[PDB]
């Protein structure tokens, strides 16, 4: 992530060709690795007959009980239960009733044991790519940047400060405020610069219709996060997962309400927790369940207000990084004159003014682009409130 000239300079032509040099050599070295292997023994006769000892259509079974005389009991998908033997090379130390095993068809015998057993709905929610830029991308939020770093990055990088006072770091963080402020960016910048793994949850993702399929996916969600790295979980749009827990008249409302009541249990209920951090985000905060807002579950409440006349300059500066800017413009024209508008408004102004230059056959962008752009973006919010009663 070092393309730091950020412009059409020969350095970025030199830097990226270095990256081309190392990856081509990494290709050619592993190309030589599968080339110059004169070693053949296959399996020195042991695993080769074993791979022929097991059946070729390997099937999947489920343990019920363990009769340890090398002759146990299993269960199929339909529930057909078979007094099968153990056909060796399996240590009887990691097989428990519930752990799924590997079976045959002709004799149904236990050949291996199936590992990791993840239902392929939670593996979709496992992020592999760092999407966007680092903390230097966003346009100045540094009082609240230092807040989220105290609970996520700093306890993982340097947990020597906390043992000197015996204080565990906070676990839950709410991001709340008006829309268009930077909630989704602050999660993506953390997921960029991190060392542990990352999990994203899009709102109504853990909602199904089979009346028990809802809460069952939540158990496997925290199970995967606990079994893997000391990592964090980002669950966004939790306004569709909690509203004050009232009792009413609809029957599909309860399997909604029950799944959202056992997330409470997995979070800060019994046993312990492990090193799992949870980051949650909404637009509205007052319509939530007060059982989730209490500390023990969430220890940080972070406001994201609409910007000022000072850090707004940093918003216009970053979104006008790589565009040909004519020297006629003043950034403080649109900032000081109008004092209402979000950070997502400013990105729309910079894109619209660039469209106005091609609209009148230009490359550079003058003040007259921003005069028409600041109009056209802002005409989507109504005229006003009250008349001059107050003075």
Interface positions, 318-337, toward ligand ATP (CB under 6 A): 318
Q: Is 180 annotated for ligand binding?
A: yes
Smallest gap from residue 348 Cβ to other proteins (A): 9
SS3 of 229-292: the string is CCCEEEEECHHHCCCCCCCCCCCHHHHHHHHHHHHHHHHHCCCCCCCCEEEEECCCCCCCCHHH
Q: Which two tokens stand for residue 144?
A: 């609240």
N- to C-terminal Cα separation, the chain: 54
| Least Cβ distance, residue 132 to ligand ATP (angstroms) | 9
- Using CB under 5 A as the binding rule, whether residue 184 contacts Mg ion is answered as yes
Whole-number Å distance between alpha carbons of 172 and 268 = 10
Question: Judged by CB under 8 A, which of 227, 228, 274, 295 binds other proteins?
Answer: 295
Phi and psi based region of residue 136 (left: phi greater than 0; alpha: psi -120 to 50; beta: remaining): alpha
Binders of ligand ATP in range 253-272 (CB under 6 A): 268
| 139: partner contacted, choices other proteins, Mg ion, ligand ATP, none (Cβ within 5-8 A by kind) | ligand ATP
Residue 183 labelled as part of a binding site: yes
Which residue in the shown chain puts its C-beta closest to ligand ATP? 343
Which positions from 174 through 203 interact with other proteins, judged by CB under 8 A?
Answer: 179-180, 184, 187-188, 191, 195, 200, 202-203
Between 276 and 343, whose beta carbon lies closer to other proteins?
Answer: 343
User: What's 199-234 look like in SS3?
Assistant: EEEECCCCCCCCCCHHHHHHHHHHHHHHHCCCCEEE
Question: Is residue 124 involved in binding other proteins (CB under 8 A)?
Answer: no
- Using alpha carbons, list the distances in angstroms from residue 137 to 133, 140, 145, 188, 345: 6, 9, 12, 11, 16
Cα separation, 186 vs 303, whole angstroms: 13
Burial-class residue 304 by CB neighbours within 10 Å (0-12, 13-18, 19+).
buried
Neighbour count for residue 137 (Cβ, 10 Å): 12
Partner from Mg ion, other proteins, ligand ATP, none contacting 251, C-beta within 5 to 8 A by type: other proteins
Of 347, 362, 371, 372, the one binding ligand ATP (CB under 6 A) is 347
Two tokens, residue 386: 């009250």
**Which of 283, 293, 366, 376 is in the footprint of ligand ATP by CB under 6 A?**
283
Nearer to Mg ion, 184 or 208 (CB): 184
Residue 172, interface with ligand ATP (CB under 6 A)? Answer: no
- Is 118 marked as a binding-site residue? no
Q: Is 73 in the site for ligand ATP (CB under 6 A)?
A: no
Q: Work out which of 80, 211, 296, 321 binds ligand ATP, going by CB under 6 A.
A: 296
**Residue closest to Mg ion when measured from CB atoms:** 184
Residue 370 beta carbon to other proteins: minimum distance, rounded to whole angstroms: 15
CB 142 within 8 A of CB 271: no
Q: Radius of gyration (Cα) for the chain, nearest Å?
A: 29
Q: Is 192 in the site for ligand ATP (CB under 6 A)?
A: no
In whole angstroms, the minimum distance from the beta carbon of 15 to Mg ion comes to 34
Query: Which residue number, 276 or 280, has a Cβ lying nearer to Mg ion?
Result: 280
Is 182 annotated to bind a ligand? Reply is yes
With CB under 6 A as the contact rule, which of the stretches 38-46, 204-212, 341-349, 357-365 interacts with ligand ATP? 341-349
Is 57 or 79 the residue whose CB approaches other proteins more closely? 79
Q: Which is nearer to ligand ATP, 62 or 283 (CB)?
A: 283
Q: For residues 53 and 192, give the distance between their C-alpha atoms in angstroms, rounded to a whole number.
A: 47
CA–CA separation, 58 and 51 (whole Å): 11
Q: What is the CB neighbour count within 10 angstroms for residue 334?
A: 20
Instruction: Please enumerate, by residue number, every residue annotated as part of a binding site for ATP.
Output: 177-184
């Amino acid at each position: 992530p070092l393309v730091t000239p950020h412009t059409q300079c020969r350095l970025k032509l030199l830097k990226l060709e270095r990256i081309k040099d190392y990856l081509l050599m990494e290709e050619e070295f592993i190309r030589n690795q599968e080339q110059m292997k004169p070693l053949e023994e296959k399996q020195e006769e042991e695993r080769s007959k074993v791979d022929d000892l097991r059946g070729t259509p390997m099937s999947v079974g489920t343990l019920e009980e363990i009769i340890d005389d090398n002759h146990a009991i299993v269960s199929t998908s339909v529930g057909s239960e078979h007094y099968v033997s153990i056909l060796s090379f399996v240590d009887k130390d990691l097989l428990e009733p519930g752990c799924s095993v590997l079976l045959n068809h002709k004799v149904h015998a236990v050949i291996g044991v199936l590992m990791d057993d993840t239902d392929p709905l939670v593996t979709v929610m496992k992020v592999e790519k760092a999407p966007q830029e680092t903390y230097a991308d966003i346009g100045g939020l540094d009082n609240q940047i230092q807040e989220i770093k105290e609970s996520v990055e700093l306890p993982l990088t340097h947990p020597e400060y906390y043992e000197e006072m015996g204080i565990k770091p906070p676990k839950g963080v709410i991001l709340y405020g008006p829309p268009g402020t930077g909630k989704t960016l602050l999660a993506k910048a953390v997921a960029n610069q991190t060392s542990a793994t990352f999990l994203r949850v899009v709102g109504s993702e853990l909602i199904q219709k089979y009346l028990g399929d809802g809460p069952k996916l939540v158990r496997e969600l925290f199970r995967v996060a606990e079994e893997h790295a000391p990592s964090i979980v980002f669950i966004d749009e939790i306004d569709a997962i909690g509203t004050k827990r009232y009792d009413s008249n609809s029957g599909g409302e309860r399997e909604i309400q029950r799944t959202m009541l056992e997330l409470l249990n997995q979070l800060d209920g019994f046993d312990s927790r492990g090193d799992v951090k949870v980051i949650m985000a909404t637009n509205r905060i007052e319509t939530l369940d007060p059982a989730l807002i209490r500390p023990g579950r969430i220890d940080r409440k972070i406001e994201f207000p609409l910007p000022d006349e000072k850090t707004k300059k940093r918003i216009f500066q970053i979104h006008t990084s790589r565009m040909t800017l004519a020297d006629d413009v003043t950034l403080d024209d649109l900032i000081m004159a109008k004092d209402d508008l979000s950070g997502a408004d400013i990105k729309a102004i910079c894109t619209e003014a660039g469209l106005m230059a091609l609209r009148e056959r230009r490359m550079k962008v003058t003040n007259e682009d921003f005069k028409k752009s600041k109009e056209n973006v802002l005409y989507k919010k109504q005229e006003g409130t009250p008349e001059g009663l107050y003075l």
